């Protein structure tokens, strides 16, 4: 479902900011997950350009740079 498919993503930041912050952060801390800042909510929270529109070219340049 749209709740489980959003709470079970690979980025713990999106899941924590969506719902069940305590339960998401507990699992992330136990499992030692490492977020890659791949979505749009993650870059909004961090404070970067979203990899969606005019920032998509910049994010492609940054990804292929390294």
């Amino acid at each position: 479902g749209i709740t489980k498919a959003s709470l079970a993503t690979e980025s713990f930041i999106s899941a924590a900011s969506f719902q069940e912050t305590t339960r998401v952060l507990t699992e992330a801390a136990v499992a030692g997950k490492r977020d890659e800042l791949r979505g749009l909510k993650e870059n909004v929270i961090v404070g970067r350009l979203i990899p969606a529109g005019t920032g998509y070219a910049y994010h492609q340049d940054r990804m292929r740079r390294r």
Partner: protein, 1316 residues
């Protein structure tokens, strides 16, 4: 006839059916409940007398001493209402209650006392209520809203459906006390009875059964009936009750007295039962295997050895019956556990019950209530006795006991406030019966199960808490007392009572800040029934049936007046005729109907007495005698209406207005509006701000006068007489000799309340509506309050509207307003607002208010005086200095930006200890002069009146008028008269004159002391200067205007006069609305109001034309009589032949602006009468006239609707909503811009607005939205420098709120970090 407040402009009424009961006092709930709370009750039923007796007498821990109550007295308030509002202290009266401390003699529990001493100890201070139902708590006026909560008692709810996910409907019974703990019983999906105290956890109800000291045999005796098995020669026959064979299957061949009645496997119908009854038999044969499915009630012990064979509540079998046969117990008793009717719920509860006796049940109850502690016997017994069997920890009120004893169908309604064993037993029995099928649940939304807790009861409850805390302190202290030295004041602490009462009246969910921006707002705030608050339901845990309008709301709660938004249906409004029962329930008047006659005796029927009779409806025709003109009249019998005969009815509604509230009954043609539009119209009519000149509604309802008079804003005369002297600030009434008392007669002065600030920064200002030397009766208005016109609620202006599209300037909902409307200042409003400049003695030295301001020129200091404050009358604008305050190193009080004004008042409060400033001294001197002058002036006025009365008594019994004038007025009381009782009257009047002189002197001294007082303030403030501005907000494009039918609108253009459409007479149209707003939202009442206002203004135009050229009184009288005779069959019936040919000239002058029309709520005018009234003038009957274009000069090619609609001005002013913010002030924890308009704050670009920028793909815009003008700090200033550098480029960093998030995660045991 008509009084002089009615024979000055008499409103034409279209009401067809007469009214047999006038509208009662509107704010009569607050005034009655607080009167019950505040007055002396010798019996002690309700009020403070019932709160002291509920606690006092208070004794020690059997320490041979007692403290007991005697009487209480309320002293005069320290300041009156006006002075309390000026200063800012609670309008309260000290509570002086006479206590009496008695300690007995030693070795004498009932003997004499060592001493008896008594004094009145000051404990607490209860705020008094004004004459309008408003409380002055901290200078601001508060209104304590009534509360609609569940009545105490027993309610059998359902919990139907969604539980257990199998469809099985459970059953629960809740015993709600007024004070105490709940006693929830409920059923199990396996049909068990679980009690639940305070909703903690389930355990079997048989635990409470044994806790009530009941044995299992007694329990089975209570909840079951016995069936007897007897030991005989053989076959072990059973006693038979033929009714027990109703609806089951015969397990074998039923026979009695030999012959077989019912064969094996047959059904036992009613015929078989009746035939067995006619057989008159009692005994039948029964196989031994049939008793295998039975349960023994009473335990059986051996007759030989005494050992128990079978205990109580256990199944039987063949071996058990064999062991019983050899014992010798000739009688066997079992339980009649029917499968459908007499379910064995108690037996299953006992089987699942783990406890065995009273002690173990008490232990289990104690473990449930207080876990984590080893239970002992005495503590558990004390707890269970304190739960529902003590008057101190549990109390069903009188209404609670009434509901409890009426729900269980008992006879007597009085009883003990505590629960008893019988009450619990009957509650469980009724729950079991409801489970069986006999009886039914009751709905919570029924108005017969919901009370009203008004101001008095709620205030009394908190006083009880304060007294409980005080008596707990006394209990702690009374055993440690040093006797013979304890006055009845050393143990009474006034802090708990005062703290509790202040906590209730100041900071509560029902001590609401009064919504006061017209009389309607306050009269509907006082008459508000809020389901929220303490003891009520929260907004989140509110179902969709509580919000809904119940059928029992008819006549008790308005259906159409409830606020939109989060709480709709929880804030119900009281009806016009609704009252409060002696217990608290709502009731409505009804005309009692005999066999065929509708009498005039009104009975107030509650919400539970209404469902028994069949009640007719208000719009049922009668013919001069109380007989229904038709055979079948539409009536509502039991929550469901249908046609009933004229003989079955026994009640009838008083009027069509009794279902709607006082706010929804001011909407003309309410029966034509959609009820959503009715709700919006009621709310907007509550929101209207009073304009500059009040203007009556041409189309009204007849309840405008009732709201105007009963709100309290109008100075209504107390005793009738002749206006002796009318000034712009006072009215003096020469009382008639008929109503003048023999002693202390004098006259009465009405001091009007001039321009002053209300709660919503509006201007409430009374002005006289009477003339000099004009006769006034009792209870007629003298001064029109805010938005009042000759004692008639006038919240707006009669606007000449046209419904037509005009070049898109009324596109969606906008209004196009002519320039003449703003030229005439029709919608111009006064907005008096105050500004405070507190001077707090901070560190580095205190502050000052000196007139020299550093780094500021003399341009801003020109308006300031030498003392630093601004002159009264200065036309200050935004940004000017009002009070020049300097902190120890400039923080002077400035006018907020964007508002002009005019300083009309300056008040300086100085802490006692700061000497003074010369402006404070000037204000004090002027106030002293005014306070002496007013007292001297009132003494002179009612002393000239007293001397006039002395002369009027002197004329009887030998008067000499020639010597009276030349004699000085000092010696006028002992002049020529005999020694009869008239001389006694003269002596009494002389003594009254001397007493008035002395009272004036002493009150002058008191006023001098009060003005020269200290007026202590908050800790750490030196002096406060409150400057009152007075803005005149003219109308402008942007501010909301609305009608009375929920047709809102924001003005889009102030069009010139020559551009507005005009008719063939050249008259411009003031307002052009949009036609398409009418069909979509079915507010057709605005079109009918437009047509009726057109007719009213046509009548007014005809009167004005007949009056402009001076015609004889005959023609005016003829035409006005024609206008007042129009109608089918009206109740008005006004004859102008009784007018004195000059009272009709005043009427004609008042009608030249347009004849006011009364159009009752559901008994209004019809279209035939509207068309006939249009015919009475010269206007077309269709309501539509020909309008030509204002600018192009060519006609609109269709007739358009033109008429006078009563437009309001809602106080959603555009200049109070416009806001802008560049780089300004930021928050503290997260470096974000602040939020709000009072604070300089930026609009929130919320979560839903970020998805809108993500959808476009705007990534740079979003990035600058959340970093550069947001949480980020260094980039925020770099961007500002770039913007003022000619370069629009950003260098964003990281938002500060993300670092806050990282630190807050790290503050837990979680380690979050950014990798490289």
């Amino acid at each position: 006839v008509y009084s002089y407040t009615e024979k000055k402009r008499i409103r034409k009424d279209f009401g067809k059916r007469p009214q047999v009961l006038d509208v009662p006092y509107l704010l009569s709930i607050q005034l009655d409940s607080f009167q019950k709370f505040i007055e002396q009750d010798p019996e002690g039923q309700y009020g403070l007398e019932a709160a002291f007796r509920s606690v006092f007498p208070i004794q020690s821990y059997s320490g041979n001493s007692e403290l007991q109550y005697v009487s209480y007295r309320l002293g005069e308030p320290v300041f009156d209402v006006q002075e309390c509002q000026i200063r800012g202290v609670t309008y309260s009266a000290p509570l002086r209650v006479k206590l009496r401390l008695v300690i007995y003699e030693r070795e004498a529990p009932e003997g004499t006392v060592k001493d008896i001493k008594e004094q009145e100890v000051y404990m607490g201070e209860i705020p008094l209520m004004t004459d309008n139902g408003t409380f002055v708590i901290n200078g601001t006026e508060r209104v304590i809203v009534s509360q609609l909560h569940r009545s105490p008692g027993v309610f059998f709810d359902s919990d139907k459906g969604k539980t257990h996910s199998s469809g099985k409907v459970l059953y629960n019974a809740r015993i709600i006390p007024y004070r105490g703990s709940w006693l929830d019983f409920e059923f199990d999906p396996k049909d068990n009875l679980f009690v639940r105290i305070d909703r903690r956890r389930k355990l079997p109800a048989t635990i409470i059964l044994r806790a009530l000291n009941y044995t299992t045999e007694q329990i089975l005796d209570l909840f079951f009936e016995k069936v007897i098995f007897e030991i005989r020669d053989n076959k072990l026959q059973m006693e038979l009750v033929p009714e027990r064979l109703r609806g089951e299957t015969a397990s074998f061949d039923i026979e009695a007295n030999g012959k077989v009645y019912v064969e094996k496997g047959r059904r036992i119908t009613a015929r078989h039962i009746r035939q067995l009854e006619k057989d008159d038999v009692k005994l039948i044969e029964v196989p031994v295997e049939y008793i295998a499915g039975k349960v023994v009630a009473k335990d059986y012990i051996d007759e030989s050895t005494g050992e128990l064979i079978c205990a109580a509540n256990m199944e039987l079998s063949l071996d058990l019956l064999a062991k019983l046969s050899q014992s010798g117990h000739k009688r066997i008793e079992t339980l009649f556990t029917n499968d459908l009717d007499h379910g064995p719920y108690i037996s299953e509860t006992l089987r699942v019950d783990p406890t065995n006796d009273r002690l173990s049940a008490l232990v289990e109850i104690y473990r449930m209530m207080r876990p984590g502690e080893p239970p002992t016997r005495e503590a558990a017994e004390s707890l269970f006795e304190n739960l529902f069997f003590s008057e101190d920890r549990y109390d069903l009120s009188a209404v609670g006991r009434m509901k409890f004893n009426r729900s269980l169908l008992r006879e007597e309604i009085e009883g003990s406030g505590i629960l008893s064993k019988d009450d619990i037993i009957d509650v469980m029995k009724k729950l079991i019966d409801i489970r069986n099928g006999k009886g039914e649940v009751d709905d919570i939304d029924h108005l017969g199960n919901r009370r009203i807790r008004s101001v008095g009861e709620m205030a009394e409850n908190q006083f009880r808490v304060g007294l409980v805390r005080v008596e707990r302190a006394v209990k702690e202290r009374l055993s440690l007392g040093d006797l013979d030295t304890l006055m009845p004041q050393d143990m009474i602490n006034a802090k708990p009572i005062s703290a509790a009462v202040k906590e209730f009246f100041g900071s509560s969910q029902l001590s609401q800040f009064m919504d006061q921006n017209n009389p309607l707002s306050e009269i509907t705030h006082k008459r508000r029934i809020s389901a929220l608050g303490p003891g009520g339901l929260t907004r989140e845990r509110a179902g969709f049936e509580v919000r809904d309008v119940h059928p029992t709301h008819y006549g008790r709660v308005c259906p159409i007046e409830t606020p939109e938004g989060p709480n709709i249906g929880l804030i119900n409004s009281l009806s016009v005729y609704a009252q409060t029962n002696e217990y608290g329930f709502l009731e409505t008047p009804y005309r009692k109907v005999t066999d065929g006659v509708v009498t005039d005796e009104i009975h107030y029927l509650s919400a539970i007495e209404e469902g028994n009779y069949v009640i007719a409806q208000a719009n049922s025709n009668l013919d001069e005698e109380g007989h229904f003109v038709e055979d079948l009249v539409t009536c509502r019998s039991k929550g469901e209406s249908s046609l009933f005969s004229r003989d079955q009815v026994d009640y009838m509604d008083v009027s069509t207005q009794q279902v709607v509230s006082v706010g929804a009954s001011l909407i003309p043609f309410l029966e034509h509006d959609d009820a959503n539009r009715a709700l919006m119209g009621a709310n907007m009519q509550r929101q209207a701000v009073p304009t500059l000149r009040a203007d009556k509604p041409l189309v009204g309802t007849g309840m405008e006068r009732a709201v105007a008079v009963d709100s309290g804003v109008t100075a209504v005369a107390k005793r009738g007489g002749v206006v002796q002297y009318v000034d712009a600030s006072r009215i003096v009434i020469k009382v008639n000799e008929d109503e003048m008392y023999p002693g202390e007669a004098g006259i009465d002065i009405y001091n009007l309340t001039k321009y002053t600030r209300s709660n919503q920064n509006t201007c409430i200002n009374q002005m006289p509506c009477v003339s000099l030397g004009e006769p006034v009766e009792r209870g007629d208005v003298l001064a029109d309050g805010p938005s009042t016109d000759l004692g008639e609620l006038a919240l707006g202006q009669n606007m000449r509207v046209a419904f037509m599209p005009w070049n898109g300037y009324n596109f969606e909902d906008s209004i196009l307003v002519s320039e003449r409307v703003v030229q005439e200042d029709r919608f111009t409003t006064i907005h008096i607002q105050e500004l405070a400049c507190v001077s707090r003695d901070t560190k580095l030295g205190p502050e000052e208010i000196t007139a020299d301001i550093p780094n500021v020129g003399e341009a801003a200091l020109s308006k300031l005086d030498e003392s630093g404050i601004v002159y009264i009358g200065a036309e200050v604008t935004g940004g000017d200095i009002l009070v020049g305050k300097v902190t120890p190193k400039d923080s002077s009080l400035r006018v907020p930006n964007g508002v002009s004004g005019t300083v009309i008042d300056v008040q300086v409060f100085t802490r006692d200890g700061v000497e003074k400033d010369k402006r404070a001294l000037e204000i004090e001197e002027m106030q002293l002069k005014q306070a002496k002058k007013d007292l001297s002036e009132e003494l002179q006025i009612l002393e000239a009146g007293l001397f006039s009365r002395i002369r009027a008594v002197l004329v009887a019994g030998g008067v000499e008028a020639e010597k009276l004038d030349k004699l000085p007025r000092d010696r006028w009381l002992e002049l020529g008269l005999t020694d009869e009782e008239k001389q006694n009257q003269l002596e009494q009047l002389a003594e009254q004159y001397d007493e008035l002189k002395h009272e004036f002197e002493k009150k002058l001294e008191a006023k001098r002391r009060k003005i020269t007082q200290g007026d202590d303030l908050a800790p750490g403030v030196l002096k406060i200067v409150k400057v009152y501005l007075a803005v005149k907000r003219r109308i402008q494009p942007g501010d909301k205007m609305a009608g009375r039918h929920g047709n809102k609108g924001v003005i889009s253009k102030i069009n010139p006069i020559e551009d507005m459409p005009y008719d063939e007479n050249g008259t411009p149209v003031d307002i052009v609305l949009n036609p398409l707003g009418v069909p979509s939202r079915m507010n057709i009442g605005q079109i009918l109001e437009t047509h009726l206002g057109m007719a009213a203004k046509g009548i007014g135009d005809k009167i004005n034309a007949m009056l402009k050229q001076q015609q004889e009184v005959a023609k005016l009288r003829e035409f006005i009589q024609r206008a007042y005779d129009l109608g089918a069959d009206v109740r008005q019936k006004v004859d102008l032949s009784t007018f004195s040919d000059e009272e009709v000239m005043r009427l004609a002058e008042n009608l030249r602006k347009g004849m006011p029309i009364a159009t009752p709520v559901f008994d209004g005018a019809k279209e035939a009468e509207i068309k006939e009234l249009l015919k009475l003038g010269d206007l077309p009957t269709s309501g539509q006239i020909r309008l030509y274009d204002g600018r192009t000069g060519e006609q609109f090619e269709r007739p358009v609707t033109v008429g006078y609609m009563y437009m309001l001005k809602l106080n959603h002013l555009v200049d109070d909503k416009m806001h802008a913010r560049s780089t300004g002030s930021y928050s503290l924890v997260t470096q974000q811009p602040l939020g709000g308009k009072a604070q300089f704050g930026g609009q929130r670009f919320g979560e839903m607005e970020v998805w809108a920028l993500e959808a476009y793909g705007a990534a740079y815009t979003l990035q600058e939205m959340l970093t550069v003008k947001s949480d980020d700090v260094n980039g925020r200033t770099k961007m500002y420098k770039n913007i003022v550098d000619g370069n629009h480029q950003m260098e964003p960093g990281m938002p500060e709120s993300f670092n806050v998030l990282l630190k807050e995660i790290r503050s837990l045991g979680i380690n979050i970090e950014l990798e490289d």
